[PDB]
């Protein structure tokens with residue numbers, strides 16, 4: 001089929017979503033595209049470069065809340081941004097995984113520069129604003145990956161017996177099995193944001 | 208070589224550390240152990256079960272701060288525990304990755320029940336204590352994985368040019384390249400803990 005960049009990335013994203021990073025091989029990508037491997041190689045040579053492109057594409061498609069509304073508080077922006085980031089990463093198998101360790105792409109520079117400047121306009125130093133952004137990002141990535149991977153491993157095996165569990169752990173596992181992860185995510189997100197705030201508002205005060 | 212459980216797990220952990228989850232194959236594990244694949248299969252059949260065992264072993268070996276000191280505050284316990292968890296996960300290639308989505312093993316029940324009870328003795332409901340524990344865990348996992356994966360991909364390719372970057376992003380990348388991730392981790396950890404505290408101390412007050 002067609003092998004422009006958009007279509008190669010579209011096929012790789014479809015494949016990722018089917019069988020994850022491990023199934024994103026030259027043979028399988030070549031097969032989905034109905035081409036031979038040396039044909040594929042002309043268009044994409046390097047798995048990390050493909051993964052990097054997929055990480056960028058996932059957010060282009062489904063990360064809706066990348067910039068603050070006019071007059072929006074930093075707290076509200078980080079909340080809305082985090083929910084959006086989470087939703088985008090949950091949209092594909094291994095979506096969070098593809099993101100890990102990437103750095104912003106040139107297609108994202110204007111957006112992420114605006115995010116950083118926005119933080120600094122709300123009183124953060126660049127460094128403290130980056131710490132807040134990194135913490136929200138890391139929290140969100142971790143939450144998504146644990147959610148995704150746990151669900152994936154139900155398929156590779158049953159959990160365990162209910163029998164030998166101690167009681168608080170038994171209830172905690174019930175609490176966790178009763179939701180997809182969003183409730184715990186939202187709770188932790190607020191705790192994170194409030195701690196950033198206490199830190200920002202302290203200035204040079206002991207806090 | 209010897210194929211008791213301890214030795215199979217020891218070889219799989221060595222292999223994980225060399226080439227990660229992708230290199231942890233039956234051929235490669237069989238090779239490290241100097242055995243044939245059907246020999247290996249008698250001892251370990253299921254990759255997820257092996258990964259699960261490795262996630263448990265990593266913490267047994269190197270997660271030193273799994274329980275509170277007598278009289279230790281919950282805040283201090285979560286801080287010390289998180290630093291320890293992070294150090295244990297950083298100790299092997301893909302260590303954080305192997306952890307993702309696991310649930311506590313029976314060998315860990317007494318310890319993790321104690322952690323949960325400890326939280327509830329310090330005023331958290333089981334659910335809110337679990338939210339705090341999950342948030343700290345998710346934050347820590349995300350931070351470690353981003354650190355590890357970024358470093359891994361320097362080897363698969365150079366980053367980019369310095370030229371076209373906007374200025375705040377340029378400085379932010381300098382800030383990040385100047386540390387391994389520990390400074391941002393510690394800062395975010397304190398923000399997290401303080402937000403848990405504001406939440407706990409509020410009780411039924413609007414906060």
Ligand SMILES: CN(C)[C@@H]1C(O)=C(C(N)=O)C(=O)[C@@]2(O)C(O)=C3C(=O)c4c(O)cccc4[C@@](C)(O)[C@H]3[C@H](O)[C@@H]12
Nearest residue numbers: 059066081085102103104108112115133136137379380
């Ligand atoms: C989740 N959210 C907080 C951000 C975000 O919404 C975006 C995005 N493209 O809209 C990121 O790229 C964002 O998710 C993200 O991935 C970022 C980073 O990776 C990052 C980095 O690794 C080094 C320097 C700067 C950054 C940033 C500023 O681009 C962040 C960025 O703020 C993150």
Ligand SMILES: CN(C)[C@@H]1C(O)=C(C(N)=O)C(=O)[C@@]2(O)C(O)=C3C(=O)c4c(O)cccc4[C@@](C)(O)[C@H]3[C@H](O)[C@@H]12
Nearest residue numbers: 172173266273288292309310311315319322340343344
């Ligand atoms: C990092 N730290 C906060 C904890 C920890 O130090 C340990 C450990 N074995 O010492 C966990 O297993 C710990 O890291 C960890 O992984 C936990 C969980 O995965 C978990 C879970 O998935 C479902 C229910 C309960 C749990 C817990 C309580 O076992 C947590 C546990 O509190 C986490």
Ligand SMILES: [Cl-]
Nearest residue numbers: 001002003004
């Ligand atoms: Cl074409």
Ligand SMILES: [Cl-]
Nearest residue numbers: 013061062091
């Ligand atoms: Cl789509």
Ligand SMILES: [Cl-]
Nearest residue numbers: 071072073076
């Ligand atoms: Cl607002």
Ligand SMILES: [Cl-]
Nearest residue numbers: 208209210211
């Ligand atoms: Cl033996």
Ligand SMILES: [Cl-]
Nearest residue numbers: 220268269298
């Ligand atoms: Cl060791």
Ligand SMILES: [Cl-]
Nearest residue numbers: 278279280283
């Ligand atoms: Cl203390």
Ligand SMILES: [Mg+2]
Nearest residue numbers: 099102103137
């Ligand atoms: Mg990122």
Ligand SMILES: [Mg+2]
Nearest residue numbers: 306309310344
């Ligand atoms: Mg866990």
